[PDB]
Amino acid sequence: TTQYLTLGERQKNVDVSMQASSGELSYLRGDKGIGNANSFVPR
Amino acid sequence: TTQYLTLGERQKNVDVSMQASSGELSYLRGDKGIGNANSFVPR
Amino acid sequence: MKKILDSAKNYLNTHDKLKTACLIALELPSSSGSAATYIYLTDYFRDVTYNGILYRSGKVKSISSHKQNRQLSIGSLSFTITGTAEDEVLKLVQNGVSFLDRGITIHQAIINEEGNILPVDPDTDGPLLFFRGRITGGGIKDNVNTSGIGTSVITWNCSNQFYDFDRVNGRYTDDASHRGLEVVNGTLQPSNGAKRPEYQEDYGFFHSNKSTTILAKYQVKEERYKLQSKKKLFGLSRSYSLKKYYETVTKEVDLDFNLAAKFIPVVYGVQKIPGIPIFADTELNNPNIVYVVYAFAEGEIDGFLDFYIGDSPMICFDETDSDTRTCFGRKKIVGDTMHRLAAGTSTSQPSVHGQEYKYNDGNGDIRIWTFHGKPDQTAAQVLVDIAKKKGFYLQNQNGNGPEYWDSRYKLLDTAYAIVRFTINENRTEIPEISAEVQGKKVKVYNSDGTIKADKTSLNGIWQLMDYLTSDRYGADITLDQFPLQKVISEAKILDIIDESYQTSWQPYWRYVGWNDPLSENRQIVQLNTILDTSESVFKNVQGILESFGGAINNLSGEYRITVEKYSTNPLRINFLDTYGDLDLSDTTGRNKFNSVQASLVDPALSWKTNSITFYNSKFKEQDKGLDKKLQLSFANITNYYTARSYADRELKKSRYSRTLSFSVPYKFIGIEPNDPIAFTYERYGW
Amino acid sequence: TILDTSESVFKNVQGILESFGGAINNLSGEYRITVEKYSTNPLRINFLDTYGDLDLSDTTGRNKFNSVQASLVDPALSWKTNSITFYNSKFKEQDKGLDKKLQLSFANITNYYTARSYADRELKKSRYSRTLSFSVPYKFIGIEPNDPIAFTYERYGWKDKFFLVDEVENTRDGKINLVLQEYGEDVFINSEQVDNSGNDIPDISNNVLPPRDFKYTPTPGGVVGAIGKNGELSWLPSLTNNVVYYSIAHSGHVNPYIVQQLENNPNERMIQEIIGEPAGLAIFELRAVDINGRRSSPVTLSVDLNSAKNLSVVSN
Numbered sequence A, B: 001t002t003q004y005l006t007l008g009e010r011q012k013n014v015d016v017s018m019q020a021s022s023g024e025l026s027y028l029r030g031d032k033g034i035g036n037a038n039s040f041v042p043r
Numbered sequence C: 001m002k003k004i005l006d007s008a009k010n011y012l013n014t015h016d017k018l019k020t021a022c023l024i025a026l027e028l029p030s031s032s033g034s035a036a037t038y039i040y041l042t043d044y045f046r047d048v049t050y051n052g053i054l055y056r057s058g059k060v061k062s063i064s065s066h067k068q069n070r071q072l073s074i075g076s077l078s079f080t081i082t083g084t085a086e087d088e089v090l091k092l093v094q095n096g097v098s099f100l101d102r103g104i105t106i107h108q109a110i111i112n113e114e115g116n117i118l119p120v121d122p123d124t125d126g127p128l129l130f131f132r133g134r135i136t137g138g139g140i141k142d143n144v145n146t147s148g149i150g151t152s153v154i155t156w157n158c159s160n161q162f163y164d165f166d167r168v169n170g171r172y173t174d175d176a177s178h179r180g181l182e183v184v185n186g187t188l189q190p191s192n193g194a195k196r197p198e199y200q201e202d203y204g205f206f207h208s209n210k211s212t213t214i215l216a217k218y219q220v221k222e223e224r225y226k227l228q229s230k231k232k233l234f235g236l237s238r239s240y241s242l243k244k245y246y247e248t249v250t251k252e253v254d255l256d257f258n259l260a261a262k263f264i265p266v267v268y269g270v271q272k273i274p275g276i277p278i279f280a281d282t283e284l285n286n287p288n289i290v291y292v293v294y295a296f297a298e299g300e301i302d303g304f305l306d307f308y309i310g311d312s313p314m315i316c317f318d319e320t321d322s323d324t325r326t327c328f329g330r331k332k333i334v335g336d337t338m339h340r341l342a343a344g345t346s347t348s349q350p351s352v353h354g355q356e357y358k359y360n361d362g363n364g365d366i367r368i369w370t371f372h373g374k375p376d377q378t379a380a381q382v383l384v385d386i387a388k389k390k391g392f393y394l395q396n397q398n399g400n401g402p403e404y405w406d407s408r409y410k411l412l413d414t415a416y417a418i419v420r421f422t423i424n425e426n427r428t429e430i431p432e433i434s435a436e437v438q439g440k441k442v443k444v445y446n447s448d449g450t451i452k453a454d455k456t457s458l459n460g461i462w463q464l465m466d467y468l469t470s471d472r473y474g475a476d477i478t479l480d481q482f483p484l485q486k487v488i489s490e491a492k493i494l495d496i497i498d499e500s501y502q503t504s505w506q507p508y509w510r511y512v513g514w515n516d517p518l519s520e521n522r523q524i525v526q527l528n529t530i531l532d533t534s535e536s537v538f539k540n541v542q543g544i545l546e547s548f549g550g551a552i553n554n555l556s557g558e559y560r561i562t563v564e565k566y567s568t569n570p571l572r573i574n575f576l577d578t579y580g581d582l583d584l585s586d587t588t589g590r591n592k593f594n595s596v597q598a599s600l601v602d603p604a605l606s607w608k609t610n611s612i613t614f615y616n617s618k619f620k621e622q623d624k625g626l627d628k629k630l631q632l633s634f635a636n637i638t639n640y641y642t643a644r645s646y647a648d649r650e651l652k653k654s655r656y657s658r659t660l661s662f663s664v665p666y667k668f669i670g671i672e673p674n675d676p677i678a679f680t681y682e683r684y685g686w
Numbered sequence D: 001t002i003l004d005t006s007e008s009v010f011k012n013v014q015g016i017l018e019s020f021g022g023a024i025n026n027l028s029g030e031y032r033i034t035v036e037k038y039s040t041n042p043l044r045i046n047f048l049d050t051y052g053d054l055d056l057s058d059t060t061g062r063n064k065f066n067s068v069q070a071s072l073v074d075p076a077l078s079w080k081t082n083s084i085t086f087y088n089s090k091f092k093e094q095d096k097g098l099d100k101k102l103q104l105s106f107a108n109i110t111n112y113y114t115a116r117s118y119a120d121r122e123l124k125k126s127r128y129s130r131t132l133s134f135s136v137p138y139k140f141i142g143i144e145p146n147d148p149i150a151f152t153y154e155r156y157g158w159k160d161k162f163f164l165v166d167e168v169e170n171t172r173d174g175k176i177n178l179v180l181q182e183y184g185e186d187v188f189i190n191s192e193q194v195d196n197s198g199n200d201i202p203d204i205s206n207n208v209l210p211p212r213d214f215k216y217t218p219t220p221g222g223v224v225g226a227i228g229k230n231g232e233l234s235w236l237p238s239l240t241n242n243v244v245y246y247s248i249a250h251s252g253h254v255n256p257y258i259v260q261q262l263e264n265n266p267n268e269r270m271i272q273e274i275i276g277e278p279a280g281l282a283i284f285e286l287r288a289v290d291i292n293g294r295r296s297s298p299v300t301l302s303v304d305l306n307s308a309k310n311l312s313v314v315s316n
Helices: A022-028 B022-028 C004-015 C086-095 C160-165 C175-178 C317-323 C381-388 C393-398 C459-468 C484-491 C537-548 C617-622 C640-653 D008-018 D091-096 D112-125
Strands: A007-008 A013-015 B013-015 B034-036 B039-041 C018-026 C038-042 C048-050 C052-056 C060-063 C076-082 C103-111 C130-137 C138-145 C151-159 C210-213 C216-219 C252-255 C256-259 C265-268 C271-274 C276-282 C290-295 C304-309 C355-361 C364-370 C415-422 C433-436 C530-532 C550-555 C558-563 C572-573 C584-586 C595-601 C609-614 C658-660 C677-680 D022-026 D029-035 D043-046 D055-060 D067-074 D080-087 D132-134 D147-152 D158-170 D177-181 D214-217 D231-235 D246-247 D256-260 D268-275 D281-288 D297-302
Touching: A007 C276, A022 D112, B013 C317, B022 B034, B022 B039, C004 C103, C018 C048, C018 C052, C018 C060, C048 C103, C076 C086, C086 C138, C086 C151, C130 C160, C160 C537, C216 C393, C256 C276, C265 C459, C271 C530, C276 C393, C290 C433, C304 C355, C304 C364, C304 C415, C304 D256, C355 D147, C415 C433, C459 C484, C459 C537, C459 C550, C459 C558, C459 D132, C484 C558, C530 C537, C530 D067, C537 C550, C595 C640, C595 D147, C609 C617, C609 C640, D008 D022, D067 D112, D080 D091, D080 D112, D147 D177, D231 D281, D246 D268
Parallel strands: A007 C256, A013 D080, B013 C609, C038 C052, C572 C677, D043 D147
Antiparallel strands: B034 B039, C018 C038, C018 C103, C048 C052, C060 C076, C076 C151, C103 C130, C130 C151, C138 C151, C138 D055, C210 C256, C216 C252, C265 C530, C271 C433, C276 C290, C290 C415, C304 C433, C355 C364, C364 C415, C550 C558, C584 C658, C595 C609, D022 D029, D055 D132, D067 D080, D132 D177, D147 D158, D158 D177, D214 D231, D231 D268, D246 D256, D246 D281, D281 D297
8 A cells, every 4th residue: 555665864954055945945844855955846 | 491580780890900811801792601800701 | 203314414513503594485375276376485684596496585584483292283383574565564464364275385494605505304405394384374463652663573374284184085975076066056067176087977976965755656567467376265166356466556655765975984994884875766666676775985895794784784693693583604703704695604705896695584685786896897787787677766757768877877986785675574664784894905015115905904004004195085195205114114013913812812803803713913903993084084093093092293294103112223312412401390190090991892792882991900009099091092993802902001101201301402403203212311310 | 032031131132132143232321232234434543543553363264164053943843943054065165174163043043044044144254354453542432342444554455444343442541442353345234245256266276297208218238338327217397397306216116216406497308317227117107296295197107127238347
């Protein structure tokens, strides 16, 4: 039915040299998406 | 079948004034034997 | 000590009036860094020409004194510039911040009676280097007093050669950093920041730092159609429902892969380290098969000894442990490595580069590929072949074609391991993996001239030398800044055979760095080091030196690695050579030590610290039973007996200690720290 | 803000002020609250107006910062703390990768973006810093801390340079001691932080170059020349100037031989001599360095050494 595979932990380091983006909010709050803290697609 | 009686905790203090012995390795790794850290018989 | 040319000693002894001059070469900030402009200065009354470089006189009023000792620290030097000069005042005031971290090289030069420079240094037949480092500050004091003479002094603050050790130089798993991509400003763009020119084409660390947390849907070829193995009790009755065979059926898998970017470590012995997952994925059709590639250590590595699957190693420690769970061979006395699985009942030996090990155990099966690091190694063949068939789910989900794991993903200088898990109802998840790896291959320099880098070494001197000569993960110090003979002699000193114990007393020989169960391997010091590159190279060097109580000093441009040791040829100093000032002080009361707490990881049990206390009963009795503990680093030592001998040696050495401070004329130039002095003074009885 | 009244009002006021980097001062019976802001109308102070003594110091090395830890509470996560770290990658690269974190109070801040902007602004502002101190007569009475000063001094390149007061001391004689504080450009909250001058990235400092011509000339026989003449090694000086020596090592020899750049003559081959060696293919490594010590690309070659000709007379 439903199965989940996990690995690692989200990295909370943020590089403020780059311009701000909503991907950071999505990543830092554990939203379901693909990407890093500096570039995150939230789906 | 099998019964165990337990008491105390092994003492990890070692007196380096006396010469080294294998009894120290046996005693410091939780081997089964009769003696102290400075003089241990490992069975 | 730094030997100086014989003619230098003759001139220093004979001549009582030395016209010393300090030559300063300073680096000006400027664009076109390859066109690095230097400003040369000297405090001599006339311009000094030295190797085609004219050192202009003036502008240098004073220079502070360089100081060093046996404990590694960032020495500081400050020199002054006349504040009445317009160029210097403008430079300090309006550019004194851009001067930070710019090189300065002060040379000490003795001038002959004919204005030539006496060739003191035997390595170049030139001056004797006095200082080298990078500016770290500024400051100008314009003091104006009415009815008098004003004052304008420019002060430049500098740090000695060891300021280069504040850098953190460690390969970082992120693709952008490893491949040398420029700091992204909007779109990406390649640059020349790669440590090696061949890294730029190495896409191995692709998919490194990303967090794919999605509710993926998979198509599993099972449980939808075709013959099913179910026969009813009745002879004729049959199960008409067709399943348990290959045919698509929807299935939601909530995968959560968080591959972070952690600094890769360096291992110089038999040590247990965790994995840094760089690539994660599962088969296109079966979610139960997951590929995860972990990064271990760096450089050419002697191989893996064993793998720890969720705290349960594949090999049982003793006879007793084998009953609790399935195992294969012992480690206590036979001390076999993982390579028994491929070659059953073989000898002990590390893993093989590009060889697969099928660790069959309860709860499922595990396939492991051991890819030792290598300067030039090909891509993971299995992963490339799978990618060509688009077998990876995340490959098809993202649409990537046969380039998802291309032949260009040749992880260079990284001992990574590919682990293929078979998720089942027993192994319901992917457990964190750790492994026991042998250290990096390390060069050992024989005295004759021949070298050998075919195996890792436990010697502290050679481990430090390797860490201090690698640009990609250490301090970029060229081998030509090291006295080879002195380093080799010190390495021999740290290889003295210790006779306080037998080789048969330590059963876990294979997992303390001993490559043979018979040959003599009772070295006086044996360091199994994990060099976590996350920390500053300064801290790593200090941690290595604290293991054997060595000391690194750089006076006169040569890097000296030395250890407190007896000498049969000390330098003889008589009190009458001294400036006559003398000061003998006693420190035994303060430095008396009679115990030490040793927290050392013991391989016999799953690698974990044992809080072991070494004390000397006689010293405590002399101390009136009072406890006095000296903080001693046991992080790099896994052999109990070497740790004990080190502790006892330090405790003994901490019983007699005095500090004697005096001064000596310039005749004795080149007295490095930790040098043997034979001080004779008949009045005291010395 | 949550103001736990149990703590002293001093602590609460300090906590509020630390959030936006403000400052409260009470000089002359006024409770002035101020923040580090750019001003277009500073007080003009000249060196001559000042007392004679002056003192300029640099603190950039100590106060360079490139990272910060933000334990900000997030309303999304049931008001639990997130350990969020803000770092400026460029600053770390300029810092040799060293981590320099500044303790920043992220309490009483729940908007993540405001926290990030605050962190980046503080990191940017903490990159340039000097402490200029002098003494001014009683005429300039009332100079509050954190006040805009336009200090002009002809001897330097300062013409109405913008400073900020940091420590004003009033004496009973009237002499007023000041300690100003220099900052970067457009690094203030009030200033227009947009900077367009950073496009031109600095280049690498590869100031060392290899030799243009380094070839080995075997010594022919039949000529006395020198006894046991294995041969000689010559090459033109490497294109980079400022060289103390070049080093050359034989394959089987532990130490490298060294040649002195005694003559700064362009296009002048400098001879390094090799003697008493086997006649074979020996790896040759023309090590090169400059005064700074940086090394150019060494020349790796293997040349069959020509056996020594015209040897010594029989000793006895």
